[PDB]
Design a protein around this ligand. Structure first.
Ligand SMILES: OC[C@H]1O[C@@H](OC[C@H]2O[C@@H](O)[C@H](O)[C@@H](O)[C@@H]2O)[C@H](O)[C@@H](O)[C@@H]1O
Ligand SMILES: O=S([O-])[O-]
Length: 417
């Protein structure tokens, strides 16, 4: 007799199903319904979602990554959710970058409800910067400051108290990570570039624009100038997080989840005992030639238009999208709320590192919600990876980067036709 809603999620928190069921238990009691959650392993999440969309067999609600909204929306399989967004405060309730992820680009109606936001900022070793005579305020004020700070960090005599070795100035992945384009995007944007741009109602690559090439080379060249260890370029973001925790890196970019890890003993997967946890700072990405930008991703929630339970599903979207559940689930995931009013909650404001992430959040920017986004990103990342391979050999020239981005741009433009 009790009605059920089926919800698909990805592994967003340490106990994905149990955490999600705790989160919705008050909703279940209030409506007299049961929520049946299925956790889609990141290895299979996108294929399961695509099959639901083509077969018309699947859950009531699914999590969608922000960059997937366009593709699933373009299939015509998602219920409009303008009513839910208006209930939560409408366009003004969201950072504009997050609002853009509610619909296919150009669409009249919203098809996704923002759930949580992934953003990246720079963690740094407060002990290392102090030793190097680098002030964070100045290092993160400008690209020129940022590179000058890395130069000072490379020259510094400072040794980690546990490793007994100097720190790498900057650690970053290259091509062997899920977030190759995301790591590049703030540098593209800060120079005045873009991955794709709309001209005359038509989307084309801008990776080979002068401004994109300026930002890309600024970032990639740090590794050829000695500021990034060759071994970092073999690794993914999770491995670079481990190197920072281990005291091997003065500066590296990640999300807000590292702050919770810094409070958790090493025996439970954290790094509380390590020098890095006791000497931890955060700064936003440095202001570039045209602007300061912070990468945003994360996930939204969508309702399949073949659902038999649309009213109750939209009540659950309002609950998950709304203030109380936004704060609770951002804490569980180590993410930031998608609902901007939640950024003022004391769970963010009481922690200095989370306050800096809130500062970084106001500069947020995301990719356009294109149906063809995955093709764009895939072709961009293949060519950026060839650029990272030249970096690893010290052979990335300006001209070599332009050749690779022209090749990427030709392939992207063909894909978008
Ligand atoms: O798939 C597109 C989707 O990806 C989202 O990130 C997923 C990412 O999460 C990491 O923690 C995990 O280690 C990776 O294996 C996994 O791919 C992203 O934030 C969304 O914006 C994006 O659309
Ligand atoms: O098109 S400009 O805003 O990146």
């Amino acid at each position: 007799m009790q009605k059920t809603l089926e919800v698909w999620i990805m592994p967003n928190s340490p106990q994905p199903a149990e955490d999600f069921k705790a989160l919705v238990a008050p909703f279940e009691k209030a409506h007299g319904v049961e929520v049946k959650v299925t956790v889609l392993d990141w290895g299979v999440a996108w294929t399961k979602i695509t099959t639901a969309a083509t077969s018309g067999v699947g859950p009531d609600l699914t999590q969608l990554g922000t960059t997937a909204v366009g593709a699933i929306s373009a299939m015509g399989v998602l219920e409009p959710v303008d009513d839910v967004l208006e209930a939560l405060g409408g366009e003004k309730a969201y950072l504009p970058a997050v609002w853009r992820t509610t619909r296919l680009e150009g669409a009249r109606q919203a098809t996704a409800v923002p759930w949580f936001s992934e953003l990246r900022a720079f963690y740094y070793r407060t002990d290392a910067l102090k030793a190097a005579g680098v002030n964070p305020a100045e290092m993160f004020a400008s690209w020129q400051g940022f590179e000058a700070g890395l130069a000072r960090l490379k020259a510094s005599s400072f040794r980690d108290p546990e490793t007994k070795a100097p720190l790498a100035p900057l650690c970053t992945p290259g091509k062997n990570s899920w977030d190759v384009l995301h790591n590049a995007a703030p540098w593209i944007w800060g120079a005045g570039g873009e991955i794709v741009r709309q001209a005359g109602g038509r989307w084309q690559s801008a990776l080979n624009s002068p401004e994109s090439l300026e930002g890309l080379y600024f970032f990639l060249s740090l590794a050829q100038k000695g500021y990034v260890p060759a071994e970092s370029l073999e690794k993914n973001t999770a491995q670079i997080e481990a190197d920072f925790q281990a005291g091997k890196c003065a500066v590296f970019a990640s999300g807000p989840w590292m702050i919770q890890r810094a409070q958790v003993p090493e025996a439970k997967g954290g790094f509380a005992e390590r020098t890095a946890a006791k000497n931890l700072g955060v700064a936003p990405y440095p202001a570039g030639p045209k602007g300061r930008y912070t990468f945003f991703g994360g996930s939204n929630l969508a309702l399949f238009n073949f659902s038999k339970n649309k009213p109750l599903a939209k009540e659950l979207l309002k609950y998950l999208g709304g203030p109380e559940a936004q704060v609770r689930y951002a804490q569980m995931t180590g993410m930031l709320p998608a609902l901007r009013s939640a950024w003022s909650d004391p769970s963010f404001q009481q922690n200095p590192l989370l306050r800096t992430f809130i500062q970084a959040a106001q500069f947020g920017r995301t990719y356009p919600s294109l149906a063809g986004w995955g093709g764009v990103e895939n072709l961009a990342v293949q060519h950026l990876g060839m650029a990272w391979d030249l970096v690893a050999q010290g052979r990335l020239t300006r001209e070599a980067l332009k050749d690779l981005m022209d090749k990427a741009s030709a392939a992207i433009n063909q894909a978008l036709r």
